[PDB]
Amino acid sequence: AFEEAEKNAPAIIFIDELDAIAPKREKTHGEVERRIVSQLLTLMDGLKQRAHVIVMAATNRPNSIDPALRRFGRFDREVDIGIPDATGRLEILQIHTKNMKLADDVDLEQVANETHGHVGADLAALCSEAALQAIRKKMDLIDLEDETIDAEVMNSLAVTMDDFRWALSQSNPSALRETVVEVPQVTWEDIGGLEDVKRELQELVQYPVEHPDKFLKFGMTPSKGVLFYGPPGCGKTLLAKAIANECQANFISIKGPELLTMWFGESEANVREIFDKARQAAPCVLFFDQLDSIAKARGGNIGDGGAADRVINQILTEMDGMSTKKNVFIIGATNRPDIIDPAILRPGRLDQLIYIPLPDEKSRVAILKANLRKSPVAKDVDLEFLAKMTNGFSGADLTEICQRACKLAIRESIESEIRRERERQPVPEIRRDHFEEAMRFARRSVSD
Amino acid sequence: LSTAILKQKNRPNRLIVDEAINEDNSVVSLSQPKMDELQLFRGDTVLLKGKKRREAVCIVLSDDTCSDEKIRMNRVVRNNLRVRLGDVISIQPCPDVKYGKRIHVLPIDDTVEGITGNLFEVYLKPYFLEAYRPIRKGDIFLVRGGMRAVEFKVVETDPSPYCIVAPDTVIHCEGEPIKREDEEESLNEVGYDDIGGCRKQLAQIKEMVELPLRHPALFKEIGVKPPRGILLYGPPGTGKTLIARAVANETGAFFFLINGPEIMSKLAGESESNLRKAFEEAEKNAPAIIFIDELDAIAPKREKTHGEVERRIVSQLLTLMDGLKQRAHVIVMAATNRPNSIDPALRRFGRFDREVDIGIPDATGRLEILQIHTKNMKLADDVDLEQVANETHGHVGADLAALCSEAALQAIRKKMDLIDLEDETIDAEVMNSLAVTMDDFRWALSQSNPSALRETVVEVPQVTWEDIGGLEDVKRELQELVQYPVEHPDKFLKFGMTPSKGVLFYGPPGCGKTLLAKAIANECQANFISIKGPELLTMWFGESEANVREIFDKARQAAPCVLFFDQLDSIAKARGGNIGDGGGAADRVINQILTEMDGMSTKKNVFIIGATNRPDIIDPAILRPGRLDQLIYIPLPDEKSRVAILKANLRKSPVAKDVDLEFLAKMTNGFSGADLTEICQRACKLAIRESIESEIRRERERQPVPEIRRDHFEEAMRFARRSVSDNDIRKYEMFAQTLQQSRGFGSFRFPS
Amino acid sequence: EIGVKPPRGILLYGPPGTGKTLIARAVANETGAFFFLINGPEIMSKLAGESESNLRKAFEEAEKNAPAIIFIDELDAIAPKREKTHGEVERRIVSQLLTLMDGLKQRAHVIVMAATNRPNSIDPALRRFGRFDREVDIGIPDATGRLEILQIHTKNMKLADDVDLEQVANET
Ligand SMILES: Nc1ncnc2c1ncn2[C@@H]1O[C@H](COP(=O)(O)OP(=O)(O)OP(=O)(O)O)[C@@H](O)[C@H]1O
Ligand SMILES: Nc1ncnc2c1ncn2[C@@H]1O[C@H](COP(=O)(O)OP(=O)(O)OP(=O)(O)O)[C@@H](O)[C@H]1O
Ligand SMILES: Nc1ncnc2c1ncn2[C@@H]1O[C@H](COP(=O)(O)OP(=O)(O)OP(=O)(O)O)[C@@H](O)[C@H]1O
Ligand SMILES: Nc1ncnc2c1ncn2[C@@H]1O[C@H](COP(=O)(O)OP(=O)(O)O)[C@@H](O)[C@H]1O
Ligand SMILES: [Mg+2]
Ligand SMILES: [Mg+2]
Ligand SMILES: [Mg+2]
């Protein structure tokens, strides 16, 4: 190959997937692979110099390449093709859609703003999905078994803004296809009370993203750390569920002990991988449910050996180390914050500690209303009195009262149907007496 | 809009297949209004298209008794198009059909075995004599004559593929006879009709596969390239390979199969060479479809794999799928159980563009799967597939196929008793007597278990709700907890609330906590997983929490499932109990359990039941509503319940009428349920002792106890003792007292 | 006529020495089928691609010698769980076995039997219908069962009048 290139000089050689044939000779056991690396080293820079031949290469993992292949005279320059920003992905969309035919209502600015962590491949996938949706819209005209499509349907075929909206709804970064979970679709209306906490959560993600120039003028960097601590059942995980839907940033959900592994150094490698995955998809929200499982004070356990204490040390460097901060927002929910390592709780890592207490009388009315928004309930039932009696009840306790009332209503409804079927051979809404019977089984989950 | 492509569009050519009256192998009948609508004339030749890209040519006729939407054709025409009664085919004119010059036909072996006469004169000449029958390459037609009707296969026609058998057309039958196995395999092919419960998945797969090939002008007009990579993932037995087979059979494109490990070779560079050769064969015969089965074996993550050969193979596949030389007419499909093990660079645009989840079917989908599976089988009238579909909760398509096979073998088992089985052949009358009965399906249902949960299977002692004495209120709640969300999902949607799915049983030992779980394991209509407390603990660093995820994930796939934790206090603890407890793994297991019950994931019909003996040490987060909301206290039985326990234990045993259970329960004030059982077992032992000495005495003289008597119970009582002490009782009454006092003021009442 | 296909998979699990191999040999001998034996450890190969090549060769030879019975000793060693197996060779062996038992090409007139001490160690995919779909437990012999075993083993030997095999069965 090199002789053919030198024969027809000037020439360019492109080696796709360089890491496939150029691993480190120190870490390679196979003799053939090491001999190939040595041959590449000699050909690309050796005693007989190249006759004006340019060599190009592409690799996902530059750090797997042999160190001798990176010095000048041998892959002189390294060029970083990185994730585009909003303007870059707008340019990519404009380039992509020049061939495509689009309706007049399409707005590429909104599509560019909505796609946060997407790369050119992701934008191409979005365009293809939108076009497929347009074809689906024109499906009821055409027949699959027809020999050809009608000319009028072909002319009417175009990509509208609704197709792009649907594609955006289905769109997700290819880096984020493993760390994907199905969120139960909670909105800010589903949460009762916590109005001050709601405002802080929205502003924390919205301000750095929608108003980056405001921070530049005032000259201060944004704050991107939150810890939720409080009694069980008070809305810590609901706030994360609402963020997973309503907030305009990527979301990664981490169960606590997921990252831990049998092997010696893989537990900390999982921490590095999940933090690097969040940096690629910035702006991204990294949520740690049950943070006390992972972030526990060092020195507590004599024998783990030291893997538990080593994992938290990796998080400390990831959250705040010698690297430029990105738009990665880390939120943690803990039930017992007294055991969290004090290094985690310092400002710059988890600076904002928000305490979510038991709901008060005003909040309990809001919680009761939020549960009953989509439920048919008799007008007789007054939520103001019900919240007054339940004093130390949590948000989960109030929901359990409503669920048990529904079960009593369903039990009566089923019995009536059996009764009517029996005599042959009701309960439109939850009534006042259903809530009274459900209240006798109610109890305070969190003790004094 | 997702299933728009599946939604069939009414066309004048679409006709329902109907039974023939006088139609032979070469004619079909259409109603006069439909013929006039289609502008068809009597005597015209038409082109018939069926399933699995099967085509047939026949002569269209008129029939006043045929429906407008129906077409009449005999069994031969139906078999040629691989269609059955009620199916839909398309009829179109077939002009420019020329007279046949030379046709080659070959007979089927099973219709010729024992026939040694001249096939031509006996069968083919009278069949084609002055008939001008239209024939096509590959049709199978049956001809009467001789000693037995003989089927023939058309292997070559001139012109091809359509010709008219003219009087001067040369008909010859010399050649290798057709094999029965090949014909049976061709008859039994997988199509899109064989997949059930995957309607949206089939819609997506058709959109990527068939739509670009049938109508590429649409994609050219809209100016986009359709996706060329499909990844199918799901648990084993969901039908990924079945869908691949259906796509291979139903498509008019070159199909190549790549099993995962078969690519591997010991010689350097030969695995990548095999991949390159496969892909080159794909573009050589374009358009083409490449299917890679068990992709996780061939394409692991390059970062986490140590072998250089695996990395080089992943890189080669990566370059083949998306490289500098773009591929245009090739579509690559892959199937794997675990998609997350695949290299991330392979899950991208240009490499496996779309991912399709072939999940566990629901009741409606599994009913369709049963209907598809049992169409070939013989079923009696009493058999109803809806009940079998409802009673198979966690079953997947492979599980349903296993159930059908087991039911069929049970059906044979019944005929096994009648015959000696040593006969050289089975009698024809017994053969016709055999059919699949609903009893066989019930026996299979009893034997059937989902393949997902074969590790977590235990032999329950078959306890019934009648075996439990007392606990009437507890029984009703337990039945309603599983039955209500499963049998009445629409009621919860109407009221708009999710069900409650948590129960904790606590009380003194021997009061019926584990007995209730045994009754649920049998009576309740949901999958059951039994978990011993410390069963999930491992000395390795992260495996203890990994076992928690697996058991909770196993219950989600088999929903509705009941997850029972016996001795919950072993894995559930208040946390922070000790400075060092296995390096903090005990506290870390609780945190994993907390997220599984209530975390950032959609809730399924998974019911968690925990029986604890001491509930004061359990983590308060676990007892929170949404995890174990309903706490039920199982106390020592009172006088009324103790009478019920005595009858439940003594129901099977033959006991004399003179014994009084009411007095027996009155004196045993503080006994448990297990204490009362020990008294009855002790009475049996004394009766067995008296019976054994009596029969020994009778044998001794040569060389009694029909029922348990009062003296047996009286002697048994002197050994009886109260296992649960008074001090232990106050401990359980204390925890229950806190729960009642935590509620606040009693007798809640709305004002006015 | 009943319109079903018989199961093609057998999994025998029990303590070592219980007689699973002898049951397989008896089945293959009395029925007109060729007995082909596969040992799990000997399939293992350090070279990449050799092990599943050996599996393919074994299956093709069994197909050639139809009717045949394929017996695999220690299926747990050859085929562990893929998610818990760090080794690539064993995982590829499991995948090859899965494809050999079930795929686009359906094997016909071939019965695969396996013997393992621990059935739960096998990959859950290998327990699916169509591939070791039925599992048979060969438990520790009973008193009358071990008496019958003694009678079978002592039929060729000469036995005195004093000896009682039932006493030997009871003491064992
Ligand atoms: N403010 C609230 N408004 C409405 N529902 C609420 C609220 N707080 C809690 N809930 C209810 O609580 C349940 C979920 O509680 P959540 O997951 O938020 O608890 P948590 O504080 O994270 O507790 P844990 O420590 O157990 O994780 C749901 O039934 C939800 O409706
Ligand atoms: N949706 C379905 N409709 C009808 N039959 C089905 C369906 N799903 C599975 N089956 C039946 O179950 C079997 C499917 O096995 P198949 O090889 O397709 O499964 P798989 O999920 O691809 O396998 P694995 O993941 O173990 O490689 C066949 O016998 C098929 O008849
Ligand atoms: N209500 C009852 N009716 C019939 N038998 C009962 C009843 N309660 C207990 N028993 C008997 O008690 C014995 C064991 O009871 P079980 O296993 O249900 O106790 P448990 O509450 O789980 O106790 P432990 O705390 O010791 O695990 C069995 O023989 C069972 O038949
Ligand atoms: N049920 C049995 N009846 C008679 N002999 C048996 C039985 N089970 C085991 N054996 C004896 O065990 C010996 C071989 O054991 P083997 O079947 O190889 O053990 P495994 O089942 O572990 O492969 C044979 O010599 C045979 O006589
Ligand atoms: Mg939570
Ligand atoms: Mg498969
Ligand atoms: Mg118990």
From Swiss-Prot, chain C:
Q: What is known of its domains?
A: The PIM (PUB-interaction motif) motif mediates interaction with the PUB domain of RNF31.
- Outcome reported for the amino acid change (mutating residue 74 to Q): Defect in ubiquitin-dependent protein degradation by the proteasome
User: What does the UniProt keyword field contain?
Assistant: Acetylation, Amyotrophic lateral sclerosis, ATP-binding, Autophagy, Charcot-Marie-Tooth disease, Cytoplasm, Disease variant, DNA damage, DNA repair, Endoplasmic reticulum, Hydrolase, Isopeptide bond, Lipid-binding, Methylation, Neurodegeneration, Neuropathy, Nucleotide-binding, Nucleus, Phosphoprotein, Transport, Ubl conjugation, Ubl conjugation pathway
A Gene Ontology CC term for this entry?
Answer: extracellular region
- Family, similarity comment: Belongs to the AAA ATPase family.
Disease field = Inclusion body myopathy with early-onset Paget disease with or without frontotemporal dementia 1: An autosomal dominant disease characterized by disabling muscle weakness clinically resembling to limb girdle muscular dystrophy, osteolytic bone lesions consistent with Paget disease, and premature frontotemporal dementia. Clinical features show incomplete penetrance. Frontotemporal dementia and/or amyotrophic lateral sclerosis 6: A neurodegenerative disorder characterized by frontotemporal dementia and/or amyotrophic lateral sclerosis in affected individuals. There is high intrafamilial variation. Frontotemporal dementia (FTD) is characterized by frontal and temporal lobe atrophy associated with neuronal loss, gliosis, and dementia. Patients exhibit progressive changes in social, behavioral, and/or language function.
Q: What result is annotated for mutating residue 81 to A?
A: Does not affect methylation by VCPKMT
Name this protein carries in UniProt: Transitional endoplasmic reticulum ATPase
- State whether keyword DNA damage applies: yes
Q: Care to name a GO molecular-function term for this sequence?
A: identical protein binding
**Subunit record text:** Homohexamer. Forms a ring-shaped particle of 12.5 nm diameter, that displays 6-fold radial symmetry. Part of a ternary complex containing STX5A, NSFL1C and VCP. NSFL1C forms a homotrimer that binds to one end of a VCP homohexamer. The complex binds to membranes enriched in phosphatidylethanolamine-containing lipids and promotes Golgi membrane fusion. Binds to a heterodimer of NPLOC4 and UFD1, binding to this heterodimer inhibits Golgi-membrane fusion. Interaction with VCIP135 leads to dissociation of the complex via ATP hydrolysis by VCP.
Lineage start: Eukaryota, Metazoa, Chordata, Craniata, Vertebrata
Please indicate if the UniProt record lists Protein biosynthesis as a keyword: no
What post-translational changes are documented for it?
Answer: Phosphorylated by tyrosine kinases in response to T-cell antigen receptor activation. Phosphorylated in mitotic cells. ISGylated.
One GO biological-process annotation of the entry reads:
positive regulation of ATP biosynthetic process
Q: Where in the cell is it found?
A: Cytoplasm, Cytosol; Endoplasmic reticulum; Nucleus; Cytoplasm, Stress granule
Where along the chain is ATP 1 bound? 16-22, 117, 153
Q: Which gene encodes it?
A: VCP
> What job does this protein perform?
Necessary for the fragmentation of Golgi stacks during mitosis and for their reassembly after mitosis. Involved in the formation of the transitional endoplasmic reticulum (tER). The transfer of membranes from the endoplasmic reticulum to the Golgi apparatus occurs via 50-70 nm transition vesicles which derive from part-rough, part-smooth transitional elements of the endoplasmic reticulum (tER). Vesicle budding from the tER is an ATP-dependent process.
Effect ascribed to mutating residue 84 to L/Q/R: Abolishes methylation by VCPKMT
Modified positions (N6,N6,N6-trimethyllysine) are 84
Q: What is the effect of changing residue 83 to A?
A: Does not affect methylation by VCPKMT
